[PDB]
Amino acid sequence: SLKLYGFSVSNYYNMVKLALLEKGLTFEEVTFYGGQAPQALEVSPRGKVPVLETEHGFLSETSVILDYIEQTQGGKALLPADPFGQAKVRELLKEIELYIELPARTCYAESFFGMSVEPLIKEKARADLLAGFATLKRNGRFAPYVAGEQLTLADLMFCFSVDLANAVGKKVLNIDFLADFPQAKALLQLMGENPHMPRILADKEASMPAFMEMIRSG
């Protein structure tokens, strides 16, 4: 009965969507843009997307949602079998989220929505991203996947964060992070050949006009 609330232009939503698809699980998509409206905050407490509705109620936060799905659902494992290896996947997932996705996100207004961001914000984003990509290069195994030889949750955070982060680099900061990170470049192409990727990208394109109208409205 799992329901995934969010929208197909959301990168964090697509991470959960890809996990569900990779694991062959049944789910219903519900269009939800989150935000600060009182009715939105009742679904998602900080107004963030995605949210997973279960028999027990709503769960928000991609990393938390993925762990819940891994614990409770069947289908292909997206973690290794040993505790320390599981924690390494989660370490890499958290590094990409905190030190690549979130800093890149501070510039998405400029890179994607045509609205310049403050110089101080770009300065901090540049430093944080340089440090984030350096952490990933140092800690990632890329064998070929982020954590080693098998697809794991960390690869979902990677493939839907590093693409946008690189676009922010080239468009906003004059830096092509992937140009000198061939391990990462190879993985991004490899994740692009995932059999569920065409579905993800098709749904994203199909959903883009409504999302942009939502933007221009508020």
Ligand X SMILES: N[C@@H](CCC(=O)N[C@@H](CS)C(=O)NCC(=O)O)C(=O)O
Is 3 assigned a ligand-binding role in the annotation? no
Judged by beta carbon distances under 5 to 8 A according to partner kind, the member of ligand X, a copy of itself, none in contact with residue 34 is ligand X
> Partners of 140 in the beta sheet?
none
Of 95 and 155, nearer to a copy of itself (C-beta) is 95
Assess contact for 161 and 92: CB atoms under 8 A: no
Q: Under the criterion CB under 8 A, does residue 5 sit at the interface with a copy of itself?
A: no
CA torsion 167→148→157→16, rounded to 10°?
140
Q: Under the criterion CB under 8 A, does residue 132 sit at the interface with a copy of itself?
A: yes
Q: Which stretch binds a copy of itself (CB under 8 A): 41-49, 176-184, 200-208, 209-217?
A: 41-49
CB neighbour class for 92 (10 Å; exposed up to 12, middle 13-18, buried from 19): buried
Q: What does the alpha-carbon distance between residue 66 and residue 152 come to, in Å, rounded to a whole number?
A: 11
**Strands of 57-60's sheet in order across:** 28-31, 3-6, 51-54, 57-60
Residue from 3, 86, 108, 109 touching a copy of itself (CB under 8 A): that is 86
Please give the residue ranges that form the binding site for a copy of itself (CB under 8 A): 36, 41, 45-46, 54, 56-57, 59-61, 63-65, 67-68, 71-72, 83-84, 86-88, 90-91, 94-95, 98-99, 118, 120-121, 131-132, 135, 138-139
Annotated binding site for glutathione: 10, 48-49, 62, 105
